Paper text:
In all, we determined 23 structures, four of them not deposited in the protein data bank. These novel structures represent enzymes involved in stress response, specifically methylglyoxal reductase (YghZ), as well as three enzymes important in core metabolic functions, phosphoglucose isomerase (pGI), 6-phospho-beta-glucosidase (BglA), and glutamate dehydrogenase (GDH). All the proteins are oligomeric (YghZ, pGI, BglA, GDH) and belong to three different fold families. Based on these experiments, we demonstrate successful structural characterization of multiple proteins using only microgram quantities of purified material.
Glucose-6-phosphate isomerase (pGI) catalyzes the reversible isomerization of D-glucose-6-phosphate to D-fructose-6-phosphate in glycolysis and gluconeogenesis, and facilitates the recycling of hexose-6-phosphate in the pentose phosphate pathway. The protein has an alpha/beta fold with an extensive dimer interface. The active site, identified based on sequence and structural alignments with related proteins, is formed at the dimer interface and comprises residues Arg270, Glu355 and His386, with the active site histidine donated from the partner monomer. The catalytic mechanism is an acid-base type mechanism with Glu355 acting as a putative general base, abstracting a proton from the substrate to facilitate the reversible isomerization of the substrate molecule. Histidine 386 donates a proton, facilitating the ring opening mechanism. As expected from the high sequence identity (over 60% identical), the E. coli pGI dimer aligns extremely well with the mammalian enzyme structures used for molecular replacement.
Author numbering:
A (entry chain A): 1 to 246, 251 to 549
B (entry chain B): 1 to 549
Write the structure that this text describes.
Amino acid sequence: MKNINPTQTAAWQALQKHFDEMKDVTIADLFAKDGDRFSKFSATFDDQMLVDYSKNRITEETLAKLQDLAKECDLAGAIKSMFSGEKINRTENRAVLHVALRNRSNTPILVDGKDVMPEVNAVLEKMKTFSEAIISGEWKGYTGKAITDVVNIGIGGSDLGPYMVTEALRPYKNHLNMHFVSNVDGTHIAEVLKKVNPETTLFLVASKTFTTQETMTNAHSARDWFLKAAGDEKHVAKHFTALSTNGEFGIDTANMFEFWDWVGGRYSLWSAIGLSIVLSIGFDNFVELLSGAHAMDKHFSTTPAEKNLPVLLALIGIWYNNFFGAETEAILPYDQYMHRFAAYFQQGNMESNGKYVDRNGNVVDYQTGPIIWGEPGTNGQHAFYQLIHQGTKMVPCDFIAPAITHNPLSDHHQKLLSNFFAQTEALAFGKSREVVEQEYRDQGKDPATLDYVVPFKVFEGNRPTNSILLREITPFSLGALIALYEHKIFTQGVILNIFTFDQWGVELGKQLANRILPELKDDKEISSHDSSTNGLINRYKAWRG
Amino acid sequence: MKNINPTQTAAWQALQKHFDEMKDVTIADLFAKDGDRFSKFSATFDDQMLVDYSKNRITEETLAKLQDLAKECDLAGAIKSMFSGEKINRTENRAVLHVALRNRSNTPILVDGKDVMPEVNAVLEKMKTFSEAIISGEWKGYTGKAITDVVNIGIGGSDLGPYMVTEALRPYKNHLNMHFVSNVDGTHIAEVLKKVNPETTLFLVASKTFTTQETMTNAHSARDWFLKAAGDEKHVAKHFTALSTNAKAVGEFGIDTANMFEFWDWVGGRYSLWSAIGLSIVLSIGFDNFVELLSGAHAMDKHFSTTPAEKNLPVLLALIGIWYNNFFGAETEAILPYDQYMHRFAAYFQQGNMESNGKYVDRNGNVVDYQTGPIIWGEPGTNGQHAFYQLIHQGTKMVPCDFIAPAITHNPLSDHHQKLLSNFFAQTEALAFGKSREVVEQEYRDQGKDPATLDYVVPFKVFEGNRPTNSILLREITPFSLGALIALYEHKIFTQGVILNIFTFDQWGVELGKQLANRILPELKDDKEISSHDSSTNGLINRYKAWRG
């Protein structure tokens, strides 16, 4: 696929001059000029997800020039290269096919001359029939009891998605109690072990590689704990399954749910790694989750760029990331269930596009991926919005909300939504000194005596947002929402000329921690490192317990 | 206190020029030129909290110039003003005295000529008595049973502190099951109410005005569920208390105003866990431990108020942060505790830091033309490491990180802790020093491979390092050590506020959102098409009416 340096193109030069003309233009002005602005800068996916990008510092012209850049970088070809199984993960020489995982239409997708769909579909059928055995109570523990608790053990890609989605979709859950263990910090597994009974608990050891130190440390601790009660290791097979590839660990071959190298960790909840999702909400809802991503995959691969939502959001993201130079993006779902959605995308986005060497192997001199953060509304709202309204850093926000709650109480939801609508309105348009002063007059006060407070109550506004309204958070709509960002992330990586699907940047810390661990196993003064590392290691030895 | 524009000082200018000479200097060279660097760029608080700021892009000279800036801005006077009860919160005309809340020494602190310590101590003695009656099972619910569950209902400062701290200190907890509700999203309260029994559940409604919309919406949904079981509002007093000063509203709710625990307007929300607002902390870990939390904050208070600037940890961190915020222009700071129990620590400081210094008008009423508060984020190690560290090591944004870890775990388990800590050590080492292309090529050669045939990968394995960090090693996370750690950051935030010439203790930026949502709520009730706002607010509101059922 093409490896075009976006900064050296004519479209980039044109975006540069446009930015100079645009940089002080105001969102309030853009709305003042065009009364139908919302209808020109919004679109709806599948009659259920409205994406309103109208409160942005953009004109029809900005989008056109940004579309010129996507075309110059051959975005259309990159998309076709991904969906068809071309081996675009060049540093690892791999296909990138999380789209095959949810390919409900079952069109063949080839890797090394072979259709991947039959194996994709076999693992799924296996997850269905396994989940039925667990959920129905047909599958029994070692003392002949039904499973009540399922404990996922994994880190990164094997943890954030399954945790995020089972939380997001609690309204769809069955009776099984779900736990997600990931930190090597012992408190994580210890806090779980003390709540669960060895005879009714199912562990899933999730790990692309099955070598990860954290996951295997945790899996071994769970194994040990289990055996302290069960006594005999023949019982392990009723209580442990694997989500990976590697068996002497003690897991029945038949208990191994496989996935493939062309499945990135941070794009893996759709595969065998999603079993904890299947066990929590059942196989049908999992398939609904797959179906939603699929419909969004279809939208992305067949919709013309001007009406293509992943592209539009990607392009708007680039305008701020690369022309305004904002470092961050906030993701703010007005939905407590979705309290882990921002966190998931910290890996989805930052591990994909947090890169500095281009597809041609050259260090870049322009910005790559942004820093993703956020908490759900209204929680985030009462923590850190002060800075978003009145700080000195521009933070583009995505506000997300369902029209329908799963927990309707009094007027909670209308109160929740009123903030959803109000915050973006506030961010865009602000509140001038004259309005501030007029409020003080309406109280019979003379604002001239209030210079100590008045200037601090002014909101400059002009702060951009997207708003995403869905009918309701369903497995299907959530599936669609996740993939929407997956493909924004894709689109940004193609344009920024980087490799969105590898992650060599995690290596050095693992290798450095590898050298350090053995040094902790004696009572000796360490001096093989720089003076800081030495200092900290030696103080630890002096203070440890 | 003084309101000096930092950008107009000789110190600011000497820093600008120093940065022009420093901007390309690497941490590797800083460490190679002086083997004693660690010892010159680190200090320990109270024989228990080592703060290592050596892996930073700083020299002795950088620190001298940053100190010069704090002097020119009268940091010392500002500190004396806060601690003495001067009304430094000028936009609201208030004192700023969270230091009084934990002032164990009981030296008088006067506001409007009156010592605040008596009232402070009186609320604490009342929290003590109440907590003992709850914890001991002496206080019975409407059916005569001891309490088993405590649900806190609050937003922002009434939620983040209590929750963060009860989590961080779970090893010190008693038998009480704690719950924290804050979102106006009905899910939040609903998920709690389905897991608790009305006869053994105690609610804490945390809200100074006792009119806060989210909190009172939640409190009222709880009252409703409670009465649907109890059948009589006379039992409210056994199951609801208030952290508030509005006696009229509290009493009307059905709560015995004897169980109104109060605080004062010189207690900011985002500094309120040390007050009445921390009742749930007292209930979860006991009054003894809460007092240890207090004493740890007080020891840090003494440190901040009495240590020379050159060894004053909140000041040093604050200055270093300013070097990156204002001279490097980094937008963010990550707080990364290698401790699962502290998983809400970073989130806590998104408020404490960002609502504090996320400001754009200086203390003289003039709009700033320089950077103020940074954006705070983070997840506990090792989780964040497998999520976002790729961008911190290999992205194009510089992210100063504070790595934090205890040397003792409360959950010892084979070699789990040693592994945890090996990551804590290794990550800052990796970020400071990196890994050259030469080293990468040598690794292949030693495999007997020809790195010339490996162009498709070699360039991508190079770590250019020179990414700064602080490392905070504690003996152990205790109520005391945690009290001091929270206070360290509170005073870092103060120092930055002072220097940056802004108002650290107000939050006028929250008002607009609130007035616009107030206008919008009644419009959500009918089926009328809405056209009272901009086209987009209208469009979203109307789509919502089409889709809501």
